[PDB]
Design an enzyme around this catalytic site. Structure first.
Site, PDB file in Angstrom:
ATOM      1  N   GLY A   1       0.799  -1.206   0.000  1.00 29.18           N
ATOM      2  CA  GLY A   1       0.000   0.000   0.000  1.00 29.18           C
ATOM      3  C   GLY A   1       0.838   1.264   0.000  1.00 29.18           C
ATOM      4  O   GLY A   1       2.053   1.249   0.190  1.00 29.18           O
ATOM      5  N   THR A   2       0.155   2.385  -0.221  1.00 32.08           N
ATOM      6  CA  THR A   2       0.816   3.681  -0.182  1.00 32.08           C
ATOM      7  C   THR A   2       1.397   3.923   1.204  1.00 32.08           C
ATOM      8  O   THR A   2       0.737   3.683   2.218  1.00 32.08           O
ATOM      9  CB  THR A   2      -0.173   4.793  -0.534  1.00 32.08           C
ATOM     10  OG1 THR A   2      -1.179   4.879   0.482  1.00 32.08           O
ATOM     11  CG2 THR A   2      -0.838   4.518  -1.874  1.00 32.08           C
ATOM     12  N   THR A   3       2.639   4.400   1.252  1.00 27.99           N
ATOM     13  CA  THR A   3       3.285   4.590   2.543  1.00 27.99           C
ATOM     14  C   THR A   3       2.563   5.675   3.325  1.00 27.99           C
ATOM     15  O   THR A   3       2.245   6.742   2.792  1.00 27.99           O
ATOM     16  CB  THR A   3       4.764   4.948   2.380  1.00 27.99           C
ATOM     17  OG1 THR A   3       5.438   4.748   3.627  1.00 27.99           O
ATOM     18  CG2 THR A   3       4.933   6.395   1.982  1.00 27.99           C
ATOM     19  N   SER A   4       2.298   5.388   4.592  1.00 34.05           N
ATOM     20  CA  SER A   4       1.648   6.319   5.497  1.00 34.05           C
ATOM     21  C   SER A   4       2.432   6.349   6.796  1.00 34.05           C
ATOM     22  O   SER A   4       2.874   5.306   7.285  1.00 34.05           O
ATOM     23  CB  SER A   4       0.200   5.911   5.762  1.00 34.05           C
ATOM     24  OG  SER A   4      -0.317   6.589   6.891  1.00 34.05           O
TER      25      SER A   4
END
Lengths: 223, 227, 231, 242, 122, 237, 234, 234, 247
Positions: free
Chosen positions: G33-36
């Protein structure tokens, strides 16, 4: 596809339901013949057996009869459910069960048991014969584990069925059906000799199991 | 001269292990010929390349059954991409396909790569072991299984068929049967370990390289909006 | 076959799925120690963070199950917290039904009996944690009872758990007025057995007394280590 | 790139790549085993025709019932596993009768087929059955809102308004000819002959009054199943015209 | 069980209750304690789950009820009305007795197949 | 559905559910092998091109437009016994084959030998039409051009035919091959409506029919009722 | 060993090494997933997301990835979309219920435990699959700021700085330096959070924060001049 | 190859973290016919290309009305569309009886999101194979929601789902700057939508039979234009 | 999910798979034996502990079901612990609360066997991996000793042994049993037999022994009403066993 009832084969039939039919084909032979005003049921029958506490033809009511082929244990329970329905219908309603109604119910029970993967369908095909209440038209029906019920002029189920269903097909004429108790009985006996117990049901709840069929056997054998 | 024969078994480990060997040592191996695909499920596809073994320039497709030869090692390798059409045809396969080839190139020994499924006579003994190695030099116990193997006999499983017909080629001298207890799933790493162990029992392989075709094993792309 | 994936007997007569649960207790790589004093019970446990970003305050494997009962879990914490809520609720229900505080041993029996369900039911997996209940029962005094996924529960005069429990236990066997003394005694043998010096961040301590069970804060632990250094 | 078995077809809830639900598709293969059923919608009434497919000469062909009456102006023709059909017909009969009790109005066949499809849809969420129905039925009825209409209800839970439809064995041949022969001005009488003509090609055995039975939907007469005498006459007229 | 012939009436025969005499409308005059006592255990259990939901969140009741359903549905013994051994442990009734345990309480409809159909709703 | 059955574990996928030729699974002898009887009275030189297909592609060759007619059938038999025969068709200068591929009744061994006989007796412009479950999109192919990516491949009868055109006796024949993506066991493959449009309007380029009239005929045969369309006409909105 | 063939096809199954591989696979879904990231400040917390813009057709104001579980709780997740939004709503239900009963905002440590039990409950039975999202959530309560990060395994801890997604190793490495360098004010972290996302990385930058001083304990987004200032700093 | 072992059901994660069984459900939409949705500030439009089973069969219904203010289109499995659409309609009517409020378009799309994401977590059931395009107009104004079976609901200015929906999507992106400014001109907005769906065509042309159009706005309750009424827009 | 397929099924050889495996678990378990004397019954076993730090008093393998009945096991403790909890509960619901007195040994064994049997045909639970030597006294049947297996089959035994040293101990009990044995003599025999089976250290701490014999009014807890006499089951303390060993 073979190991479940809920799975259709790619060609479009459920193998597991079919496999139940081969169980019927392994069972003892049963026969049924419709006369003009009567129906005849014949069945296929050790040294030490107690023959006085045994009849493969069990009556579901005073006017209805039910033969079977396949697993005996399953049949004994399918018969019991039919008997209760016959009296329950005679109780909730006043008239006795129609022959078409009973086979529809019996087929429904077999069909019902096919609606889950945790239940083994009854490996028994019934051969229901009888007369509608206050009617003189003989009616013979056949049920299968799949739940399909059909009306037959003459049918045989179980061991040596194709050979016996071929003998009947050529000797029985739908336009010239037998018109005497002896005539249908002779056909049923002749049907069984191609490979004896004979039961005759007549209108108005007159069911009798024949004895001394040797006369017909001797007569048929000579011819 | 040696030949390695992968068997279509649980997880396709013998087939996957061959892919590890051929592509990892791609600089040494080369395409030799295509054996008859009569008794296998017929199979046509493009040429697999290291992440090419086929040296001929005009070739465009790979067959169901092929043989690869290593000049440096004098080693042959069969790559079976499809299973046998039926169980009984294995007798046809060995007699009409393998035996003529063994005498054709005077193969001294044949190495059979197999895998056994735990859930599928109960020949399994000392199950803590995961590998096995049967040997034969010119339920039954014909094969001489080495210690530290998960079995010491052969059940109704396939290996009985091939060994009998081979027993019943002057150049041929010995037989080896390598097996691995495995399970279904992504056996890419399991096959690599199986290839490592058989090698241990070689350069040995310093860097294992997957075939390019293995990239598509899990699908083509991951272009959608659920992560 | 199926014996490997569900808890049923293998041909050797052993439940592989239950035995694999024991190996999951060492995944966290944390070892504990519990000893009994004259009037109090003390339990020690390592607090390997190890990440710098990870806040050491919330990294605790010691739970205050009840007023008098506390338990230390070896294994993954998601299973530990699930076990805590079970024990945290069994103790309250027992008081409601029977009108007195939950004893330490009976709680282990209830939790152990619950674990037995997972070892017999095919569709229920073993929890995969080892629970060490420490308390000072008003009848039996200080007591330590340890539960394991197999469903066993045993009382201990002194117990250690984790990958290096054998190293710790052997030292206690060789060795065999206030809770501050036993805390120092427990810490010293943990240092001696493992050989690793400890700080406030690397250690967590729980003490069970007659009145209640409490967990020492970071500063309180530092004081005990300072006292050890005085030796 | 090895050949391996694929199990996207065995399960009923298992999607295959590209989103195909095979078990539903295999259910349609069961329909092709069933006897041919024809249905033509037009002015002056709808007409239904079904191959009886006598298993053996001893079988009571006069009792084979592939056409069943659901409402006095609605008729249904079924093909496939007749055992599964009885469950659907019973539900359809109850819904039509229930609608009259609740609204004192004949159930709209477009609503009736919707109710029936809601039952065949039950293999998933409306679940009551493990597998999809192995029977595809053909509803012919007349409601005084849309006129004489014919509906085809697949086991998948989708119904289509068909001018002319053929199901069961030989449906591919029947449909191809219906495309060549059907037209808006098709009167009822020639439609009955047309249905019999279609049955002639796709029925493996001889066409006869004993193995084929016709039915029609008319406002004045309602749903009626033709007697053996009339079908013999129509078959006689058909071969004379040929 | 409703009559097969007519799906609007109780099956007087299969429902062995002493005839149709115990008609539906007449089962209204009841002992004051019958209704409260019959489902007393259910009320306590549901109330207990509500407190778990309030304090421990919806996760705990979900885990408790899922375990019970696993035990109940995987246990089919048509020759015993006794509760499962593991059911007592989950309900915490493994060291308790009640009149429902001491007093657990026909040729036609008591057969095994009757329970098989009801168990599977076939 | 509270739980998944413990017993419900699939058999290993390395083995296929292919038909069992002989019940004697314990046979330790060389199994009997099929024979193929190609009719010798066929005047092959009269036909400039030959088309090899499986039955799922029948709608591409309408009887109504092409004036298709039979010339005979191939016979195949096997003792243990099995016997299958497959008609041969043609229209104009084109020779056409349809094998009636099946996964349950017909084992792949029969298709293999038929591929042998077809190629051993045709060795004209070969057209091979097929399907594969391992191709993402439609592929146009010939002897000297490969479009398949390494992951993809072709199996079944069409693989049997292509094998002989590439390797084995009589290799090197010029052929043009078209395979459309599909799913399902042999003999029951399903094609999407998108594939059918891409399929008729492309094979018409080679066969040379009036594309619009040819498409109009084919769609009716594709969509009205066919094994290839299946439930896709009503299973989807 | 990262596949665990044989013990990986079913949930709630222990491998011979004690690992449950289905949970480990769910972790790998998180890593795609998109890094958060989430930064804990002295007065609050900061959340940042690299929302990868897919098309112009999306409504910019309604396309928000930093969910607000409660007025005082901020939540950001990486991994499967169905599981992330399913968990948020369930967490949203718990926060409302706690406020409804006890008439006070739910504490962050208590909120994390309720989520942890729910996430962990799906690793017990084979009829369900573990959630495939690692959720970073935090807020402010009576005890101050809290930042938590629960994994698909159900394990959660308090963090001074958290990161997820594909851009995880780089963000965590830089995030460690920030804590080491300034062991922050709510203002400063917003600039630093923007910097880390840009270093980790077409993508747009979404940032939110909740602090006692600058927002009286409420969770608000970064917009207008503040946003641009953070981009300029990055 | 390895995908076959881990695509059995919606409960098994693959070793790479992929959840195949739900990916296929998303791919099932491509089997459905193309439908296009777009909206302006005040008006929202749906355009759908119906398909017939045979030339003798009526074209399948593809646009549904949940109330006078909002409706939806369908693409994918018919049975799933039947379940979801009517379930949504069961929710439009429920709110009015007890509360007498119009259920807002945003709430309509999100109550359905929870329905789809449950099927992707439990065994036995399967993910829905139908995608929805919901358009409505309430106090807030125009709305266009695209629901994917994976429980992903996105607010959109315009979109296209179904077979060959990429072409329509590309046109909408190329013309986003235009049709948003088509305010107070319902007739022109539909023409843009009809043009948008036209790019997805391959062989079949627009006809009064196959084409269906819907529009809703401040002055236009949900109306469906089908049959002869669609001739003008072609 | 309406059903679950049975875990225990017949093999092609006619044997039940899980049952035989369960018996193996008992065989691999710790040894336990019982001897039926003329005036009492003895049940004995030895305690294996994970570490010496374990409290031996809590490792109670011999347990009381009724004051006149006692049981010991060999195999999985948790299964036996659950069974005893149910066995005690069943002894009150089925018999005592109905007849006002504790059930006889044969009936209690039958009801325990019924519990173990219903696990042998079930889709959720494996069979219990324990075999219990249930010893008790009945007013009519007198002293009795029963062995109940995982299959639910229970047999009365004069003297028996289960576990690792079953075969070795059973043969030793064969040569040293008679109808004239006294309870004191039986205890001596039981301690002997257990000495060959036990690996390692043999004292009163690694061994626990319980006896069914004469009443123990001192253990009743109250006086008066002589018709209500004490219990018969007595668990010998480690002190008593040590004294017996030296003799």
């Amino acid at each position: 596809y073979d190991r479940a009832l809920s799975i259709f084969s790619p060609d479009g039939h459920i193998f597991q339901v079919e496999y139940a039919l081969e169980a019927v084909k392994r069972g003892t032979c049963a026969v049924g013949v419709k006369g003009k005003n009567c129906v005849v049921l014949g069945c296929e029958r050790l040294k030490l057996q107690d023959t006085r506490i045994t009849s493969k033809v069990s009556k579901i009511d005073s006017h209805v009869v039910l033969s079977f082929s396949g697993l005996n244990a399953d049949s004994r329970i399918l018969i019991e459910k039919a008997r209760v329905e016959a009296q329950s219908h005679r109780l909730t309603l006043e008239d006795p069960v129609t022959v078409e109604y009973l086979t529809r119910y019996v087929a429904g029970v077999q069909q019902r048991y096919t609606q889950s993967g945790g239940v083994r369908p009854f490996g028994v095909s019934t051969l229901i014969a009888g007369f509608d209440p206050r009617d003189d038209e003989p009616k013979l029906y056949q049920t299968e584990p799949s739940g399909i019920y059909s009306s037959w002029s003459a049918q045989t189920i179980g061991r040596n069925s194709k050979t016996v269903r071929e003998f009947l097909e050529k000797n029985y004429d739908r336009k010239e059906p037998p018109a005497t108790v002896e005539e249908c009985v002779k056909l049923t006996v002749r049907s069984l000799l191609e490979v004896i117990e004979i039961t005759v049901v007549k209108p108005d709840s007159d069911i009798v199991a024949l004895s001394s069929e040797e006369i017909n056997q001797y007569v048929t054998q000579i011819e | 001269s040696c030949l390695v024969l992968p068997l279509v078994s649980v997880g396709n480990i013998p087939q996957l292990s061959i892919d590890w060997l051929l592509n990892s040592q791609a600089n040494e191996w080369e395409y030799l010929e295509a054996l008859d695909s009569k008794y296998l499920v017929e199979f046509v596809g493009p040429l697999d390349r290291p992440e090419s073994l086929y040296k001929d320039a005009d070739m465009k497709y790979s067959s169901a059954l092929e043989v690869f030869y290593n000049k440096k090692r004098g080693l042959f390798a069969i790559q079976q991409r499809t299973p046998l059409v039926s169980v009984n045809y294995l007798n046809n396969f060995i007699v009409e396909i393998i035996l003529p080839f063994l005498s054709k190139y005077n193969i001294s020994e044949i190495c059979i790569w197999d895998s056994l499924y735990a859930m599928e006579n109960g020949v399994i003994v000392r199950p803590q072991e995961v590998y096995s190695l049967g040997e034969f030099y010119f339920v039954n116990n014909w094969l001489h299984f080495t210690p530290t193997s998960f079995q010491d006999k052969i059940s109704v499983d396939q290996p009985i068929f091939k060994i009998l017909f081979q027993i019943l080629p002057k150049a041929l001298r010995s037989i080896k049967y390598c097996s691995c207890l495995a399970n279904e799933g992504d056996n890419s790493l399991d096959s690599q370990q199986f290839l490592q162990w058989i090698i241990s029992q070689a350069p040995p392989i310093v860097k294992f390289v997957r075939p390019i075709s293995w990239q598509g094993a899990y699908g083509m792309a991951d272009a959608r909006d659920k992560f | 076959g199926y014996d490997r994936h569900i808890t049923i007997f293998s041909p050797e007569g052993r439940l592989y799925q239950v035995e694999y649960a024991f190996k999951a207790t060492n995944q966290t790589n944390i070892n504990s120690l519990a000893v009994r004093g004259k009037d109090c019970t003390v339990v020690i446990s390592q607090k390997k963070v190890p990440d710098k970003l990870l806040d050491p305050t919330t990294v605790s494997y010691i739970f205050c199950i009840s007023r008098t009962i506390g338990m230390v879990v070896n294994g993954p914490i998601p299973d530990a917290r699930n076990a805590a809520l079970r024990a945290k609720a069994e103790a309250a229900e027992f008081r409601y039904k029977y009108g007195y505080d939950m004893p330490c041993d009976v709680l282990a029996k209830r939790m152990a009996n619950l674990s037995q369900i997972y070892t017999q039911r095919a569709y229920m997996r073993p929890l995969g944690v080892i629970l060490t209940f420490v308390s000072v029962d008003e009848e039996l005094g200080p007591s330590i009872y340890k539960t394991d996924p197999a469903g066993y529960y045993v009382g201990y005069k002194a117990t250690a758990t984790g990958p290096k429990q054998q190293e710790i236990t052997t030292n206690l066997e060789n060795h065999f007025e206030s809770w501050e003394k036993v805390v120092e005694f427990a810490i010293t043998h943990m240092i001696d057995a493992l050989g690793t010096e400890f700080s406030k961040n690397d250690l967590e301590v729980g003490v069970a007394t007659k009145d209640k069970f409490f967990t020492l804060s970071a500063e309180n632990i530092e004081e005990r280590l300072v006292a050890i250094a005085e030796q | 790139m090895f050949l391996t078995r694929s199990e996207y077809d065995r399960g009923v809830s298992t999607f295959s790549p590209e989103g195909r639900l095979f078990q539903v598709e295999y259910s349609l293969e069961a329909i092709k085993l069933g006897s041919t059923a024809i249905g033509i919608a037009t002015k002056e009434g709808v007409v239904l025709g079904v191959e009886k497919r006598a298993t053996s000469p001893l079988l009571e062909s006069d009792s084979i019932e592939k056409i069943v009456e659901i409402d006095r102006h609605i008729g249904c023709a079924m093909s496939g596993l007749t055992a599964d059909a009885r469950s659907m017909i019973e539900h359809a009969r109850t819904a039509a009768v229930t609608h009259n009790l609740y609204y004192d109005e004949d159930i709209n066949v477009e609503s009736l087929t919707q109710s029936v499809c809601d039952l065949a849809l039950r293999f998933g969420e409306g679940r009551l059955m493990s597998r999809p129905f192995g029977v595809a039925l053909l509803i012919a009825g007349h409601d005084a809102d849309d006129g004489y209409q014919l509906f085809h209800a697949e086991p998948s839970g989708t119904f289509y308004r068909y001018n002319a439809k053929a199901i069961g064995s030989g449906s591919e041949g029947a449909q191809a000819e219906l495309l060549n022969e059907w037209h808006s001005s098709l009167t009822l009488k020639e439609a009955e002959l047309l249905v019999l003509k279609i049955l002639k090609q796709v029925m493996e055995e001889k066409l006869d009054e004993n193995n084929a039975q016709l039915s029609c939907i008319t406002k004045q007469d309602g749903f009626k199943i033709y007697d053996n005498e009339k079908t013999a006459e129509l078959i006689k007229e058909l071969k004379e015209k040929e | 069980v409703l009559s097969s012939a007519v799906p609007s009436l109780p099956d007087t025969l299969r429902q062995q209750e002493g005839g149709a005499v115990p008609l539906s409308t007449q089962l209204n005059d009841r002992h004051p304690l019958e209704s409260t006592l019959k489902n007393w255990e259910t009320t306590q259990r549901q109330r207990q789950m509500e407190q778990y939901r309030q304090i421990f969140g919806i996760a705990e009741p979900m885990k408790r009820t899922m375990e019970m359903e696993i035990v109940n549905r995987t246990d089919f013994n048509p020759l015993s009305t006794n509760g499962s051994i593991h059911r007592d442990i989950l309900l915490n009734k493994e060291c308790s007795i009640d009149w429902e345990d001491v007093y657990p309480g026909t040729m036609v409809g008591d057969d095994v197949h009757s329970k098989i159909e009801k168990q599977l709703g076939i | 559905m509270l739980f998944k059955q413990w017993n419900d574990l699939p058999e290993p996928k390395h083995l296929l559910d292919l038909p069992e030729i002989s019940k004697n699974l314990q046979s330790l002898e060389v199994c009997p092998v099929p024979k193929v009887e190609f009719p010798q009275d066929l005047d092959v030189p009269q036909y400039s091109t030959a088309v090899i297909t499986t039955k799922i592609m029948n709608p591409l060759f309408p009887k109504n437009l092409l004036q298709l007619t039979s010339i005979g059938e191939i016979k195949t038999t096997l003792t243990v016994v099995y016997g299958f025969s497959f008609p041969i068709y043609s229209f104009g200068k084109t020779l056409l084959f349809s094998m009636e591929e099946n996964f349950i009744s017909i084992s792949p061994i029969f298709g293999n030998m038929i591929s042998r006989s077809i190629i051993s007796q045709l060795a004209p412009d070969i057209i091979v039409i097929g399907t594969s479950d391992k191709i993402a999109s439609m592929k146009v192919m010939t002897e000297n051009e490969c479009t398949l990516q390494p992951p993809e491949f072709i199996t079944g009868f069409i693989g049997s035919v292509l094998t002989q055109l590439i390797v084995g006796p009589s290799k090197g024949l010029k052929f043009k091959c078209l395979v459309a993506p599909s799913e399902g066991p042999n003999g029951f493959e399903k094609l999407s409506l998108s594939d059918m449009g891409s399929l008729v309007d492309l094979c018409g380029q080679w066969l040379g029919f009036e594309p619009s009239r040819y498409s109009e005929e084919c769609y009716r045969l594709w969509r009205c009722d066919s094994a290839a369309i299946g439930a896709q006409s009503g299973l989807y909105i | 060993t990262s596949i665990g063939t044989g013990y990986d096809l079913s949930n709630s199954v222990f491998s011979p090494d004690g690992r449950n591989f289905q949970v480990e696979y769910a972790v790998k879904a998180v890593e795609n997933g998109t890094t958060s990231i989430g930064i804990k400040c002295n007065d609050g917390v900061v959340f940042a997301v690299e929302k990868l813009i897919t098309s112009k057709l999306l409504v910019p104001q309604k396309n928000v990835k930093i969910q607000v579980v409660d007025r005082h709780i901020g939540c950001v997740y990486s991994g499967l979309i169905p599981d992330g939004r399913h968990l948020v709503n369930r967490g949203r239900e718990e926060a409302a219920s706690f406020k409804k009963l006890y008439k006070t905002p739910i504490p962050i440590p208590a909120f994390a435990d309720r989520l942890g039990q729910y996430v962990q409950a799906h690793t017990l039975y084979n009829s369900v699959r573990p959630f495939g999202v690692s959720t970073i959530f935090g807020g402010v309560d009576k005890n101050g700021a809290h930042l938590y990060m629960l994994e698909p395994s159900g394990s959660y801890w308090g963090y001074k700085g958290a990161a997820t997604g594909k851009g995880r190793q780089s963000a965590k490495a830089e995030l460690e330096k920030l804590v080491d360098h300034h062991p922050l004010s709510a203002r400063e972290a917003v600039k630093q959070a923007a910097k880390i996302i840009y270093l980790a990385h077409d993508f747009e930058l979404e940032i939110s924060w909740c602090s006692l001083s600058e927002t009286n304990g409420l969770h608000k987004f970064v917009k207008g001049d503040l946003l641009q200032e953070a981009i300029d700093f990055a | 190859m390895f995908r076959n072992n881990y695509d059995g059901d919606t409960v098994t994660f693959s070793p790479t973290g992929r959840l195949f069984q739900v990916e296929y459900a998303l791919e099932a939409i491509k089997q459905g016919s193309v439908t296009v949705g777009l909206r302006s500030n005040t008006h929202a439009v749906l355009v759908a290309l119906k398909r017939n089973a045979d030339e003798l069969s009526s074209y399948q219904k593809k646009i549904i009305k949940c109330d006078e203010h909002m409706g939806l289109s369908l693409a994918g499995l018919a049975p799933d569309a039947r379940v979801l659409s009517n379930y949504l309609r069961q929710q439009c009517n429920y709110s009015s009886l007890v509360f007498n409020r119009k259920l807002a378009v945003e709430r309509a799309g999100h109550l359905l999101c929870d329905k789809a994401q449950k099927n992707t977590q439990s065994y036995g059931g399967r993910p829905y194979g139908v995608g929805l395009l919901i358009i409505g107009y309430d106090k807030s104004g125009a709305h266009l929601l695209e629901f994917q079976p994976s429980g992903n609901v996105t607010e959109l200015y315009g979109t296209a789902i179904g077979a060959r929906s990429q072409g329509a999507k590309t046109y909408l992106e190329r013309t986003l700057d235009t049709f948003i400014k088509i305010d107070g001109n319902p007739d022109e907005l539909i023409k843009a939508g009809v043009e948008a769906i036209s790019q997805s065509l391959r062989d079949e042309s627009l006809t009064v039979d196959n084409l269906s159009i819907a529009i809703v706005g401040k002055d236009t309750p949900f109306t469906i234009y089908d049959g002869e009424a669609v001739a003008k827009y072609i | 999910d309406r059903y679950s397929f049975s875990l225990t099924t017949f093999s092609p050889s006619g044997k039940l798979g899980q049952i035989d495996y369960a018996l193996t678990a008992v065989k691999q378990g710790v040894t336990s034996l019982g001897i039926k004397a003329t005036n009492g019954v003895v049940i004995a076993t030895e305690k294996k502990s994970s570490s010496p730090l374990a409290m031996s008093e809590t490792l109670s393998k011999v347990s009381l079901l009724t004051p006149d009945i006692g049981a010991v096991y060999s195999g999985m403790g948790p299964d036996y612990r659950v069974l005893v909890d149910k066995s005690r509960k069943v002894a009150h619901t089925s018999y005592k609360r109905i007849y006002g007195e504790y059930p006889p040994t044969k009936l209690l064994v039958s009801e325990v066997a019924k519990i173990m049997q219903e696990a042998t045909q079930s889709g959720g639970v494996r069979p219990f991996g324990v075999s219990l030597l249930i010893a008790g006294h009945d007013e009519f049947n007198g002293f009795s000793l029963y062995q109940v297996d995982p299959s639910g089959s229970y047999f009365p035994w004069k003297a028996t042994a289960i576990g690792k040293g079953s075969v070795a101990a059973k043969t030793f009990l064969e040569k040293r049993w008679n109808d004239e044995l006294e309870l004191e003599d039986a205890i001596h025999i039981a301690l002997l037999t257990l000495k060959e089976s036990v690996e390692g250290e043999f004292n009163g701490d690694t061994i626990e022994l319980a006896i069914i014999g004469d009443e123990n009014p001192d253990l009743l807890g109250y006086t008066g009403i002589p018709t209500d006499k004490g219990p018969r089951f007595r668990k010998l303390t480690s002190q008593e066993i040590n004294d017996r060993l030296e003799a």
